[PDB]
């Protein structure tokens, strides 16, 4: 029994209210240009030699002891053509111990027609005839045919294609024929099928936060307050700021030549586990909502069935009326238009994702190979041969 | 009041059905083959010698002049051996300035008995002593015990054990005693404790979404067509394929030499940023169906509760009885087998997850010790100094 | 029509109890260190000298040769500051084939007053001056400004400041006056506004799992069992052990020396993905729970309609009346304190969180200059020149 008599209130049920959330989904459409140039179309050749002019003349002739020099040689376009072509590199003649007579081939416009594959040069001399002069001439070259992946700068407005040196420097690549260029014993021959950029109209995914964060296939980026902003593979530029011109955001360079530590990494790694904890927590929250519905929910149909014997067949879909024998236990005994209460929406999911790993510009394989050759010849420059 | 003369319908409850989600979770049962052994089972050994034999016997002569050669002399197997043991190498004797009787001492055969725990040559030459040879040798050992990870590739079936060369170059372990090989100036010997290759049976969970996505330890990998797949450090093949000879899905030996860039780690962050907001679009709409069913679970016990009075004092676990004062408001007085209406089970939650981060193959200290070894060489054959 | 006589049971409801989770967050009170020094505070100056004393006496002369020796003289503290100051080196003459009467310029102690922006030196030696001397110096110089940053370790207890070489050696900062140090060509002087260390009391958020995984700004890092750790750039002390002289966790110094490869990143990658089909698949299942209520709770009201015709009116916040034609189809008609259910809080969701990326130690300016000087020695060092 209770106590009709007084009662207590007038009481009202709390609702429950979501905590706004100023993240959407957006589908931003941007004017995307591309430089992308796939295939062999980077041919690097480098090709010196080494000279080591004599004369023998006696201890008292001021003219007694050697001439040397490394003197590169880069190929021209044309050779550097028919060399990454053939994967053969041509030089002049190796010369040892060639004197007076022959010691005039030290200095001939050799006119190089000697093939190699791969030719390394010898630091060799000799001044031992006197009276004499003594030439010695050793050759070295080399070739391949990578390809290169140019990337994309602003130095103002209206991206440009860009070849990035190892060193930080960037090299313009000519819109109009066969970019071609010439560094010391090296020459970069760079040769796509199509000159320029190209760009289409397409429309990105973000996450509006003031902030915008953006994913376009494996490329993952914050889009900036301007909407124009230029990855070293491509530039984003929203329409609506299309017939503007704007200085878009900058990749940093030392981004692509610099590595990241294994510290970098395993910060990663902690980031990750703090919001995969993050979200066990949310989890947890949640499945302890549901546990509280259940019970509430067990508790009404637990009032209800007691008026509408026909309420729990409905819940198990099978054909039974109730019979309550106490308030929590009970018996059970054998047997157009739509209304949406809820207006609940398919469950958005967050979808796969995998971001895409490049390396460094150093490890591409046209530098790797310059850098070997560098050392190859610091290899063989380390002592003086006799070619007595 | 109402009105009802007039209906309009009839209707129907519209109930909301999830969409249905292809992804699983499975326990596939694999043979991980395994090629692990841990502990200092590596030396590397280099030694060489610098020689300048020279003779001066006057301009006139023919032969006035030096031979000099950098000759590498790399440990035998037992000579590594001994060395590693000892963390000392052995070399022959420094020459300084031995002249015409001692000068012969150039070509001995020196039978290697000075020992040295780190030892680096000197580049001198000497010709200043008139119709007599001059002689100088210089010497260069050093000897390293780290502990070397072998990977594992295909080159068809059968994964086989392999040192990886930081060039990329692949050397298979002798499966049958210490592999040991000679390059130049080094030698390197490897030793485990037990040969060949091990493997065990076990399931690796996966997430089956055409894809598999795989997980075994600290390894993450997605499982390919036709269950077999080799990653560096080890082999998965899956049962039901065990009796069928298959060529493994391979790793790219490039992704252990090179390095990433520190863009390439910021595009992984940014695709985590996109991926957290993802999420926390998903947790607000599921907070914002919570409140809904809040709001329709208060109205629906205001009006059972209107029926049943013992009904709110069961939902808050008090005992009391309900009174309304309005169809909003209320007032308060004092006072075997079970049925499943849910069918709920424990929620799945994403368990913690770090992955392995080994570096690459450049910096492993046995690598790193031959790099050392070779730059220190370059650095002392920069200028000859003068043995007088 | 249904079988009132013979029931089954007693029944009663089963409830759905979550699983219980340990995870919580804690906002742990910290005793944070930090070595920050912002701006250009580094200066790394070198200078060296070739030099080429030789003596042509004829070949029976004992004394006829060169003398050759690459000198390092690096500049003073004083010379360092005005070098950094104003971005030019200072060094001696350059001297090309002085013979006999200016040959005694080889030893002069040159008072350093040539100045230089920047000046690589040239390998060059001269002998043909008979029964004369023969001197040849050249100069090498260069200086840089850059922004060193510091590590902090332990050695123990009491956190130290730390500057970390590339081959892994630590030199401590004096904490009095201008570290200043020396080796080889090089001299390096660091100057910060402020000495010693700093540090503040702060909370960081942890997620208690025996494992605190903790994030302090762009730092994840996991919190040891005795509430002591050191990262690169800070260390966190718990109070609570303020009193309390303890060894910190040590973070290791190859993790900021040894790059991460791009294999490392991609299975950083692999292991994202699998946690994001993890958590979708919980997500699933919450949505599948949505289901399920959505159908009960339409069954739920489809009963309690039945008696509370003023019901599906309030659940859609129109006033309306029902009217069922079937026990599924209806018809409709026109027409102080609160009380806590659900006891529901805000949902927790996980904040936006991007990892700090700094790279390797190589990488940094200072050490690339040093790199760089010494790679541009090597190359000048490669043959002699005739400075006949």
Same mark, same amino acid.
């Given at each position: 029994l =209770?106590?009709?008599?007084?009662q207590?209130?007038?009481? /009202?049920?709390?609702?429950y209210?979501?905590?706004?959330?100023?993240?959407?989904?957006?589908?931003?459409?941007?004017?995307?240009?591309?430089?992308?140039? $796939?295939?062999?179309?980077?041919?690097?050749?480098?090709?010196?030699?080494? $000279? @080591?002019? *004599?004369?023998? +003349?006696?201890?008292?002739?001021?003219?007694?002891?050697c001439?040397?020099?490394?003197?590169?040689?880069?190929?021209?376009?044309?050779?550097?053509?028919?060399?990454?072509?053939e !994967?053969?590199?041509?030089?002049?003649? !190796?010369?040892?111990?060639?004197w007076?007579?022959?010691?005039?081939? *030290?200095?001939?416009?050799?006119?190089?027609?000697?093939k190699? $594959?791969?030719?390394?040069?010898?630091?060799?001399?000799?001044n031992?005839?006197?009276?004499?002069?003594? *030439?010695?001439?050793?050759?070295?070259?080399?070739?391949?045919?990578?390809?290169?992946?140019?990337?994309?700068?602003?130095?103002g407005?209206?991206?440009? %294609?860009?070849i990035?040196?190892?060193?930080? /420097?960037?090299?313009?690549?000519?819109?109009?024929?066969?970019?071609?260029?010439t560094?010391?014993?090296? @020459?970069?021959?760079? @040769?796509?099928?199509?000159?320029?950029?190209?760009?289409?109209?397409?429309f990105?995914?973000?996450?509006?936060?003031?902030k915008?964060?953006?994913?376009? +296939?494996?490329?993952?980026?914050?889009?900036?307050?301007?909407?124009?902003?230029?990855?070293?593979?491509? =530039?984003?530029?929203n329409?609506?700021?299309?017939?503007?011109?704007?200085?878009?955001?900058?990749?940093?360079? @030392?981004?692509?030549?610099?590595?990241?530590?294994?510290?970098?990494?395993?910060?990663?790694?902690?980031?990750? &586990?703090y919001?995969? !904890?993050?979200?066990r927590?949310?989890?947890?929250?949640?499945?302890?909502?549901?546990? &509280?519905?259940? #019970?509430?929910?067990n508790?009404?149909?637990?009032?209800?069935?007691?008026?509408?014997?026909?309420?729990?067949?409905?819940?198990?879909?099978?054909?039974?009326?109730?019979?309550?024998?106490?308030?929590?236990?009970?018996?059970?005994?054998?047997?157009?238009?739509?209304?949406?209460?809820?207006?609940? #929406?398919?469950?958005?999911?967050?979808?796969?994702?995998?971001?895409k &790993? !490049?390396?460094?510009?150093?490890?591409?394989?046209?530098?790797?190979? &310059?850098?070997?050759? #560098?050392? %190859?010849?610091?290899?063989?420059?380390?002592? /003086?041969?006799?070619?007595?």
């Amino acid at each position: 029994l =209770c106590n009709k008599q007084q009662q207590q209130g007038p009481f /009202t049920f709390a609702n429950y209210q979501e905590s706004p959330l100023n993240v959407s989904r957006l589908q931003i459409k941007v004017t995307k240009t591309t430089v992308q140039d $796939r295939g062999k179309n980077f041919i690097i050749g480098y090709r010196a030699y080494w $000279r @080591s002019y *004599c004369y023998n +003349g006696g201890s008292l002739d001021g003219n007694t002891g050697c001439y040397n020099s490394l003197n590169p040689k880069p190929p021209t376009k044309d050779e550097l053509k028919t060399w990454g072509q053939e !994967e053969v590199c041509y030089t002049g003649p !190796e010369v040892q111990d060639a004197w007076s007579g022959d010691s005039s081939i *030290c200095f001939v416009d050799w006119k190089m027609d000697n093939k190699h $594959r791969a030719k390394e040069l010898e630091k060799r001399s000799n001044n031992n005839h006197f009276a004499h002069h003594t *030439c010695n001439l050793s050759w070295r070259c080399g070739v391949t045919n990578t390809h290169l992946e140019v990337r994309l700068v602003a130095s103002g407005t209206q991206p440009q %294609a860009v070849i990035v040196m190892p060193n930080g /420097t960037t090299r313009a690549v000519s819109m109009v024929a066969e970019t071609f260029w010439t560094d010391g014993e090296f @020459s970069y021959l760079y @040769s796509p099928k199509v000159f320029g950029t190209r760009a289409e109209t397409k429309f990105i995914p973000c996450f509006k936060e003031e902030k915008f964060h953006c994913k376009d +296939g494996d490329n993952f980026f914050e889009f900036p307050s301007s909407g124009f902003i230029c990855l070293p593979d491509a =530039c984003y530029k929203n329409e609506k700021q299309k017939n503007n011109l704007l200085h878009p955001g900058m990749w940093n360079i @030392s981004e692509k030549l610099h590595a990241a530590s294994v510290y970098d990494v395993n910060n990663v790694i902690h980031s990750l &586990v703090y919001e995969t !904890e993050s979200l066990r927590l949310s989890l947890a929250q949640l499945d302890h909502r549901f546990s &509280v519905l259940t #019970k509430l929910m067990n508790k009404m149909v637990s009032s209800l069935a007691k008026i509408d014997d026909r309420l729990i067949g409905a819940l198990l879909e099978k054909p039974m009326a109730s019979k309550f024998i106490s308030p929590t236990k009970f018996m059970v005994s054998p047997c157009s238009q739509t209304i949406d209460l809820f207006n609940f #929406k398919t469950l958005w999911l967050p979808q796969l994702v995998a971001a895409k &790993v !490049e390396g460094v510009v150093s490890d591409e394989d046209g530098w790797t190979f &310059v850098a070997n050759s #560098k050392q %190859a010849l610091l290899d063989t420059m380390t002592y /003086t041969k006799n070619g007595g």
